[PDB]
Each structure stands twice: as structure tokens, then as C-alpha cells.
Amino acid sequence: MTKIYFAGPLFSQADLRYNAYLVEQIRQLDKTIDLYLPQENAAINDKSAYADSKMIALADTENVLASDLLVALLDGPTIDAGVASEIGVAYAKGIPVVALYTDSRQQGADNHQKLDALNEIAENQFHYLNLYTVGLIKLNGRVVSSEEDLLEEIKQRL
Amino acid sequence: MTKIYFAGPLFSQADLRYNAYLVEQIRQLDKTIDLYLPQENAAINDKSAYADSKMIALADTENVLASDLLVALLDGPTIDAGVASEIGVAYAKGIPVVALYTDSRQQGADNHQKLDALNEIAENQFHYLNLYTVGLIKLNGRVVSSEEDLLEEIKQRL
Amino acid sequence: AMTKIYFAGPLFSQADLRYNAYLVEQIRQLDKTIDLYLPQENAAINDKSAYADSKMIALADTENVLASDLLVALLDGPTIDAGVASEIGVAYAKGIPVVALYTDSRQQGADNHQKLDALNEIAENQFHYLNLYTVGLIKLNGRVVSSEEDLLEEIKQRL
Amino acid sequence: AMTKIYFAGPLFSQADLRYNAYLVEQIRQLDKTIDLYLPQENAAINDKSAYADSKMIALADTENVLASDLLVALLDGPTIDAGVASEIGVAYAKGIPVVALYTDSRQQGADNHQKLDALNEIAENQFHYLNLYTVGLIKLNGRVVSSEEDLLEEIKQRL
Numbered sequence: 001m002t003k004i005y006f007a008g009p010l011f012s013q014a015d016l017r018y019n020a021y022l023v024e025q026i027r028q029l030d031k032t033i034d035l036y037l038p039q040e041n042a043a044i045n046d047k048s049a050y051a052d053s054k055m056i057a058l059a060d061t062e063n064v065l066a067s068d069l070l071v072a073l074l075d076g077p078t079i080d081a082g083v084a085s086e087i088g089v090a091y092a093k094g095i096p097v098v099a100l101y102t103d104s105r106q107q108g109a110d111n112h113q114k115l116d117a118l119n120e121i122a123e124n125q126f127h128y129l130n131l132y133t134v135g136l137i138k139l140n141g142r143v144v145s146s147e148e149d150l151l152e153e154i155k156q157r158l
Numbered sequence: 159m160t161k162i163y164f165a166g167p168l169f170s171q172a173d174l175r176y177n178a179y180l181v182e183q184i185r186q187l188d189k190t191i192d193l194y195l196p197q198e199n200a201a202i203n204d205k206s207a208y209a210d211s212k213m214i215a216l217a218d219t220e221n222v223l224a225s226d227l228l229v230a231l232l233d234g235p236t237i238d239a240g241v242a243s244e245i246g247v248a249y250a251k252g253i254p255v256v257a258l259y260t261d262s263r264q265q266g267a268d269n270h271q272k273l274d275a276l277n278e279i280a281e282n283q284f285h286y287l288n289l290y291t292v293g294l295i296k297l298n299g300r301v302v303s304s305e306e307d308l309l310e311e312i313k314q315r316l
Numbered sequence: 317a318m319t320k321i322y323f324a325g326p327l328f329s330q331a332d333l334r335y336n337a338y339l340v341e342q343i344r345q346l347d348k349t350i351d352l353y354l355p356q357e358n359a360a361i362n363d364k365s366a367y368a369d370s371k372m373i374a375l376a377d378t379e380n381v382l383a384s385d386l387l388v389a390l391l392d393g394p395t396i397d398a399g400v401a402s403e404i405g406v407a408y409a410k411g412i413p414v415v416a417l418y419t420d421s422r423q424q425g426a427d428n429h430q431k432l433d434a435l436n437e438i439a440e441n442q443f444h445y446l447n448l449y450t451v452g453l454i455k456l457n458g459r460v461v462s463s464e465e466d467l468l469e470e471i472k473q474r475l
Numbered sequence: 476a477m478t479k480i481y482f483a484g485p486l487f488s489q490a491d492l493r494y495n496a497y498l499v500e501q502i503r504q505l506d507k508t509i510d511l512y513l514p515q516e517n518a519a520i521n522d523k524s525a526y527a528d529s530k531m532i533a534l535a536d537t538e539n540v541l542a543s544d545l546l547v548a549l550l551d552g553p554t555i556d557a558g559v560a561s562e563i564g565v566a567y568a569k570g571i572p573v574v575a576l577y578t579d580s581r582q583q584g585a586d587n588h589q590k591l592d593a594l595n596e597i598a599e600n601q602f603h604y605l606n607l608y609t610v611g612l613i614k615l616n617g618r619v620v621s622s623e624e625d626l627l628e629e630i631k632q633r634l
Contacts, residue, residue, distance in 0.1 A: 009287065011307065012233035013260040016180070018172035023347070045262070050271035052281055057611025061567075075170035075396045077236055081555040081606035088564020089612075090538075101439055102171040104203070109435035113208035118426035118443060122391075122460040123210055123419055126435060127169065128445040130557035135533025136565075143439040147171065217450025219408075234552045234599070238437075239396040246405020249378075259598055267594035276585035276602060280550075280577055280619040284594060286604040288398035294406075299597040300356025308424035328603065329551035330578040330623065331494035338493070362580075369599055392488035393553060419489040421521075430526035437538035440528055444487065464489065 001032045002158055007087070008073030009080045010039040016128065017062050019073075022100075026071070029151055030158055035071075036063050063088055069157060071150070072099040072137065074129060084133045095143035097136075098157070100150045103127045159190045160316055163222050167232030167238045168197040175232075180258075180305065184229070187309055188316055192223050194228075216273070222247055227315060229308070230257040230295065232287060244292045255299035256315070257292075258308045260283045318473050320351045322381050324404070325390030326397045331467040336390075337466065339417075343388070343470045346468055347475050353380050381406055386474055388467070389416040389454070390445060401450045404439075414458035415474070416451075417467045478634050479510045481540050483563070484549030485556045486515040495549075498576075498623065502547070505627055506634050511547075514541050540565055545633055547626070548575040548613070550605060560609045573617035574628045574633070575610075579603045 006023055009015045016039055023037050038060070043049050051059075060082075064070065070090045071152050072083055105127035108114040117123040137143055144150050164181055167173045174197055181195050198220070201207050209217075213302055218240075222228065228248045263285035266272040275281040280300050295301055302308050326332045333356055353378065360366055364473055366432050368376070377399075381387065387407045389400055407414050424442035425431040434440040454460055461467050485491045486497050489514055492515055499513050514536065519525055527535070536558075542545065546566045548559055581603035583585040593599040613619055620626050 001336075003632070009235070011261045011263055013231060014172050014176035014231075016262075021175070022577045027258060043267045045269075047266075047268045047270075050269060052275065052278075053607040054614050055609035055611070056607050057609075057615055060608050060611070064286070074173075077167070077228060077234060078240060078554055079557040079560075080235060080559040081557065082608035084555075084557040085558035085564035085567075085606075085609045086565075087610055088561035089568045090564075091561075091567045099439075103169045103172075105169055105445070106441065108202045108205075108437070110205045111203075111208060111431075112205075113517035115432050115435075117208070117210065118432075120210075121423070121462050122416075122446050123448070124423070124445055124450045125448065126441045126443055126445060128422070128441055128443065129439050130561075131440075131442065131529040132536055132558035133533075133561045134439045135529035135531070136561055137374045138439075138530050139533060145438050212455050213452070214448050214451075215456055218449050219453070231452075236395055237398040237401075238381040239398065239401040239428070240449035242401035243397040243450045243453055245406035245448075246402035246407075247409045248401075249403075250406045250409035257336075257598075263604070264597070264600065267591075273591050273594075275394055276591075279582070279621050280575075280610045280614075281604050281607070281609065282602045282604055284600045284602055284604060286602065287598050287599055288402075289370040289599075289601065290375045290399035291374075291402045292443060293370035293372070293596045294402055296371050296598075303597050304576070305388035308507070326553070328579045328581055330553060331490050331549075333580075335490035335493060338554055350617040363587070364582050364584070367587060367593070369596075370592060390490075392490060394485070394556065395553060397553065420487045421492075424521050425523070427523040428526060429523070431625070434526070436615060437528075 001034050001067060003067045004033060004035040005067035005070045006035055007070055007083045009076065011030045025151060026154060029155055032158065038065065052053055052143045061089060065093060067095060070095055070097040074099050075103055079133050087133055087136055089138040090136050091140060097137045098150065098153050099137045099141065099143045101143055101145055105147065159192050159305040160227060161225045162191060162193040163225035163228045164193055165228055165241045169235065179242045182307060184312060187313055190316065194225065194275055215257045221248060222249060225253060228253055228255040230255050232259045233261055237288055237291050245291055249298060255295045256308065256311050257299065258293055259296045259301055264303065297314050318349050318351045320384045321356045322384035322387045324400045325388055327392065332457045342468060343471060346472055349360060349394055349475060353384065378406060381411060386411060387412055387414045391416050391418045392420055396447055396450050404409055404450055404453050408453040408457060414454045415470050416462065418460055420460055423462065449474045477508050478545060479543045481543035481546045482511055482513045482561045483546055485552065501627060502630060505631055508634060512543065538566060541569060543571060546571055546573045548573055550575050550577045551579055555606055555609050563609055563612050567612040567616060570634045573613045574626065575613045575619045576627050577619055577621055582621065
């Protein structure tokens with residue numbers, strides 16, 4: 001069996017719903033996939049339950065280091081800081097990362113007016129990802145821009 | 159009829175899907191609701207189509223100023239800068255704003271350990287929204303934390 | 317006639333606090349008729365008894381924005397500061413011009429053809445991104461500059 | 476024995492460039508045995524012919540991270556810089572300690588009972604937020620400080 005850690009923000013309803021939607025597609029791909037989704041394991045917010053950052057980081061890292069493959073969602077105004085740190089841990093431990101990046105503002109490389117606009121001040125139409133975090137992914141993994149490509153890449157790594 | 163402008167990030171698949179999911183619930187609320195969703199009106203990314211920031215801001219503002227009510231999604235690591243600007247325009251023009259904020263890290267006010275942890279350095283478990291943007295909303299509108307409360311608030315403003 | 321300037325920008329980290337003070341000093345040295353309001357100079361000292369909720373936070377800041385003749389906005393950061401973005405929207409709707417500063421070094425490279433060709437690859441964009449709705453509101457009645465020299469020069473022309 | 480320090484932090488705006496240089500000067504003045512690497516001092520001059528994609532960007536920076544004995548990280552900003560967060564994850568997994576600086580003025584007010592009671596209201600949190608996974612990795616082998624004085628004091632103790 002292949003153990004997958006699904007890295008991604010899990011705090012808003014938009015992200016919670018999208019994670020569950022993607023994960024079910026990944027789990028229906030192959031019965032040997034053992035995917036760990038953090039939102040499925042978080043304790044319901046109770047007034048007596050508490051864990052500090054050290055406990056949080058230690059428990060989260062244990063799930064990362066136990067996986068064979070990390071699936072990371074990079075979308076947002078910036079890459080989620082927790083996801084970025086998890087990618088750094090995975091790279092240093094040799095765990096491959098397949099990342100999904102669907103931002104519609106990444107398209108336009110064939111649009112010569114978008115390219116020319118870069119000569120103007122504050123006219124860039126291409127969304128930006130921190131290239132250090134991206135480079136760590138590509139040094140052992142891949143960044144895909146569609147759910148179709150993500151499922152195929154996970155399938156080819158089984 | 160009541161015209162609504164749905165403000166929110168519309169670039170990732172997670173946000174695109176969540177916007178369409180929420181908007182259909184808002185439209186099924188009342189037949190007099192005329193909701194404008196920007197993603198339903200964006201041109202398909204074609205290599206010849208281009209508009210600079212001034213054209214983008216002018217067309218977007220025209221849709222904001224034509225609405226009777228603004229629905230704003232505040233979730234994310236930060237409030238979307240475009241949404242924040244749209245809220246500033248709406249407040250200065252007297253257009254009310256009903257905002258949705260579902261981040262699960264906002265809960266814990268009854269957790270005394272989370273409160274005590276604030277005496278430590280870098281142990282805050284409560285997600286942060288820029289309070290200037292939030293204040294503009296509350297000066298003429300409301301911030302709700304659930305889709306159920308959002309639909310009821312929109313219903314009560316018809 | 318005095319020119320009242322509102323200095324919009326994040327003011328929470330030491331890096332931003334020091335940079336705001338370093339820029340405001342240069343702006344005030346341009347002309348004696350400049351009456352610049354800097355929010356960090358008016359913030360109340362942190363006290364366990366004092367409290368102001370979001371409504372009176374936004375109202376107090378908006379009062380200073382609306383009383384200004386020109387708004388200087390700092391756009392740098394991983395994203396445009398949400399408060400600054402909202403203040404820009406207020407300024408545009410009220411007709412108050414905005415001169416914005418954007419020094420991010422990742423905005424350069426329009427002449428580099430390899431940077432342009434890299435956009436055909438997934439996740440290889442080297443150009444920092446600003447939300448173009450916020451930028452457009454500035455340019456519709458103002459200007460975005462990329463250096464402190466051009467910022468001071470633009471402020472002088474608007475006196 | 477020399478102590479090699481990697482200075483992690485955003486280095487793209489003038490505010491961050493000036494603050495990094497202002498802090499690094501103080502750090503180097505602590506002890507002659509400090510060999511601090513500052514990425515902005517090694518960046519190539521912007522040239523339309525030079526290009527490095529994300530893989531060689533990450534590799535070049537990781538080489539400097541892994542060659543260090545201590546990592547100093549700046550966490551301020553609306554969010555922790557994504558590159559800094561990744562570098563912290565690399566440092567933790569390799570066992571390189573991290574001393575982080577976090578000066579955001581919105582972290583104060585734990586004694587204010589009205590700030591604490593305001594958390595029962597929707598969208599009234601006055602306390603700035605840092606991703607606690609990134610913070611936890613630091614404290615598991617290092618420390619987070621809230622002032623430049625405590626940063627220099629902590630660096631001296633680790634020499």
C-alpha cells in the first residue's frame with residue numbers, strides 16, 4: 001500500500017470542501033492508497049482540548065514522515081505557511097511531493113499583450129508562487145495545474 | 159428586485175467551486191435576487207484578449223456600484239486585496255456589506271488554555287482578520303460565520 | 317495652502333515601522349506645506365484597560381483618510397495589506413488621489429526573454445504579483461512608482 | 476570555532492532589504508566568530524541574459540541553509556514568508572536550530588481582558604496570527620523572540 005499525506009489549508013469551508021472532494025477522487029483511484037487527510041483526524045473544538053505549537057508540529061510531522069508521497073495544494077494569495085514548512089520537511093527527508101496549482105491567473109504565456117505589459121509598472125497579470133518552495137517540489141516531485149493531471153500523476157507513482 | 163455583488167477570490171478551483179455552490183443557495187432563496195458573480199462573466203482566457211488594471215478596476219467597480227448589497231468572502235490567509243478594496247468602495251458609497259468568515263481557527267473564546275497561551279510568545283491559535291476592513295463592514299453590514307447565517311441575513315435584507 | 321497627506325502602509329513589524337519613519341522624514345523634508353499624518357505616531361500606548369473594537373478602529377482611521385488631500389500607499393509585502401487595500405478603495409470612491417510605492421525587486425525582468433519563456437512552464441513565474449483591481453483604482457486617479465526618488469518627485473509635483 | 480549563520484527572511488522590498496542589513500550589522504558586531512550569510516548580499520545583478528529556474532533557485536539557497544550551524548528567521552509580515560517557512564522545515568528535518576524574530580505589535584494584549592472577551596464576538600480578534608506548525612518546528616529546536624535585544628542575546632548564548 002502507498003501512504004499519502006494530503007497537505008493543504010483546512011480552515012475555511014471552501015478549503016475543507018475542496019479537500020474532501022479531491023481526496024475522494026484520489027481514494028477511488030486505487031484501493032492500495034492509504035491517504036491521510038488532517039481534517040478527518042482533528043479533534044472537534046472543545047473548551048478543554050489544547051495543544052501548543054510544539055505538540056502540533058510534532059504530531060503533524062509524524063504523519064508527514066510516515067507517508068510515501070505528499071500531495072500539496074499551493075493555491076491561495078500565498079502558499080500556506082504550514083504547507084510550505086511541510087514541503088521543506090518532506091524534501092529534506094526524501095519524500096516526493098506532487099503539488100496542485102490551479103490559479104487561473106497562471107495562464108497567458110501565449111498572450112503577447114500580457115508579456116508586453118510587464119514593461120509597465122504594476123501591470124503583471126501572472127499570479128506568483130514563491131519559487132523556493134516550488135523548487136523544492138520539483139527537485140523531487142512535480143507541480144500540476146489540473147485535477148486530471150494530479151490523479152494521473154498519483155496513478156503513475158503507484 | 160435586489161441586486162447583489164458577490165465579492166470573493168475566484169482564481170483557484172477551490173474558490174471557484176465554493177462561489178458557485180454558495181451563489182446557487184443565495185439565488186434559490188428568492189426569485190427577486192439578481193446576483194452578479196464575476197466568474198460567470200469573465201472572458202475565457204484568449205491569447206488576444208487583454209485589459210490593463212485601469213480597465214479592470216473600472217469595469218469591476220461598475221458592477222459594485224450597481225448593486226444594492228455586497229456579499230464578501232473574507233476567508234484565506236489574508237483577506238483578498240481586491241475584496242478589501244471593493245469593501246472600501248462599497249462603504250464610501252453607502253452600499254451595505256454582508257461578509258462570510260468560516261475559518262475554524264476563530265473558535266476557542268471559551269477555551270481558557272487558548273486564552274492563557276496568549277501570554278506566551280507565538281502561541282496564538284486565533285486566526286486574524288485585518289480589523290480596518292472588518293470595521294468598514296460592520297459600520298454598514300454584518301460578518302457571519304456560517305452559510306446558514308449568511309442566507310438568513312440576506313433573506314432579512316430583502 | 318497646506319497639503320494634508322495620509323501615509324497608508326502596514327505599521328506592525330519593526331521593518332515596516334522603521335521604513336515608514338524613514339520615508340515620512342524624506343517626504344516632510346520636501347516642502348514645509350506638507351502636513352503628513354502617520355498612523356504609528358498617533359497610536360495609543362498599549363494598555364490593558366484600553367480597548368477599541370473594529371468599528372471604532374475603522375472609523376478613527378477613515379476620519380484621517382477622508383481629511384487628507386493626497387494618500388501615499390505602500391503596496392509591498394507578499395500581498396497588499398488588507399487595510400491599505402480598503403483605504404485605497406475609500407480614497408478612490410471619495411475622489412482622493414493615491415500615489416503608491418512598489419519597490420519589490422521581483423517586478424524586474426521584462427527584458428529577460430528566458431523569464432518570459434518560462435511562463436510556458438507550470439509554476440515558473442518570477443514576476444511578483446499585485447492584485448490588479450487595487451492597482452487600477454490607484455492609476456485611475458494617481459500613480460504607482462517603483463522607487464523612493466520617483467515617490468518624492470511625484471509628491472512635489474502634486475503640491 | 477566559527478559559527479555559520481543563515482539569515483532567513485524576505486529580501487524583496489526596500490523595507491525588508493533595509494531591515495535585514497540593519498539587523499545583520501548588529502549580529503556581526505556581537506562576535507568576530509560569526510560568519511553570517513545574507514542572501515541579498517549574494518544575489519546576481521539583474522541581467523536580461525541571466526536566468527535561473529525554480530529548481531536551481533531552491534538548490535542554491537538550500538546549499539547555504541545546510542552549510543549553516545544556526546538559522547535566524549524573520550517571521551513578520553501578513554503571513555510568514557513561504558520561502559522562510561520552507562527553509563525552516565528543511566532546517567528542522569536536518570537538525571539545524573532556528574532562532575526566530577517576531578516583532579508584530581499586534582501580538583500584545585494578553586493582559587487586556589476586553590481583548591480576550593472580544594473573541595466571543597465574530598471577527599474581533601486583535602491578536603496577529605502565525606501558522607503554529609511553522610512556529611512549532613522552531614521551538615522544537617530553537618526559540619522565538621519578540622525583540623531585537625532578545626535576538627542578539629540568544630545568538631550570543633549559542634556561540
